[PDB]
């Protein structure tokens, strides 16, 4: 399908639990790449921080990591997703089920 | 709300390479100069993030606080205290029944 649905969460073990990190429900194009998604996450996190500072009593804006994207495959293990892959290809190659695609993130380091 | 602002970069204290694009703003007369300075900081930061988002670069990053001025007679600009309400600024300094003209520059 030209459109793709994602359920996007912090990696369960590569990132510390954070009750402030909500599951994200995302629709984008199948032709979007993993690189677009990783860059999106960094931008979204920064936008949210800015808006949160805006509404807080802080007068100074302080305010940046790069992220790797993972998928849990049928084996239950995780695969690091190549940045050049389209989300369409990821769905066909690694997810293969008729459900919104569950993807995870953790910092590149 | 009821206070109307025509908000511009300080003509001289600018960074030449930056946009001079006038902003048109409405808010409550009870808003303070500190609210307006902070609003600017947030808006510029948001605009910069979205711009980087749309740029070809894969790497982002994290800037400044701002001083607010109003023009006065003659050929000068008066720095406005952050605690002043915008209503007070219009009555004290602007006076005329037109959208108020304010200016900004990074706080040195």
């Amino acid at each position: 399908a030209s459109e793709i649905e994602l359920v996007f969460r912090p990696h369960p073990t590569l990132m510390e639990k954070d009750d402030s990190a909500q599951t994200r429900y995302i629709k984008t194009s199948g032709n979007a790449t993993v690189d677009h998604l990783s860059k999106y996450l960094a931008v979204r996190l920064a936008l949210e921080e800015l808006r949160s500072k805006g509404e807080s009593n802080q007068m100074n804006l302080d305010t940046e990591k790069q992220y790797t994207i993972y998928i849990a495959t049928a084996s239950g293990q995780f695969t690091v997703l190549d940045g050049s892959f389209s989300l369409e290809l990821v769905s066909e190659k690694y997810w293969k089920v008729n459900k919104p695609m569950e993807l995870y993130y953790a910092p590149t380091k | 709300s009821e206070i109307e602002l025509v908000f511009r970069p300080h003509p001289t204290l600018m960074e030449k390479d930056d946009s001079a694009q006038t902003r048109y703003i409405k808010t409550s007369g009870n808003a303070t100069v500190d609210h307006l300075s902070k609003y600017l900081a947030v808006r510029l930061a948001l605009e910069e993030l979205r711009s980087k988002g749309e740029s070809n670069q894969m790497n982002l990053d994290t800037e400044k606080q701002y001083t607010i001025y109003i023009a006065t007679a003659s050929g000068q600009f008066t720095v406005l205290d952050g605690s002043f309400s915008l209503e007070l600024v219009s009555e004290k300094y602007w006076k005329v029944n037109k959208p108020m003209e304010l200016y900004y520059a990074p706080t040195k």
Binding site: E5, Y25, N31, T33, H36, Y40 | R50, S55
Partner: peptide
């Protein structure tokens, strides 16, 4: 709400639409 963000990579811009819940957003697969 549904935020909409445009992101560029490798000279292609795409849109990401994001909601805070699946219900009412994701399509019915039944």
């Amino acid at each position: 709400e549904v935020t909409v963000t445009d992101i560029t990579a490798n000279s292609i811009t795409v849109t990401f639409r994001e909601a805070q819940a699946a219900e009412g957003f994701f399509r019915d697969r039944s």
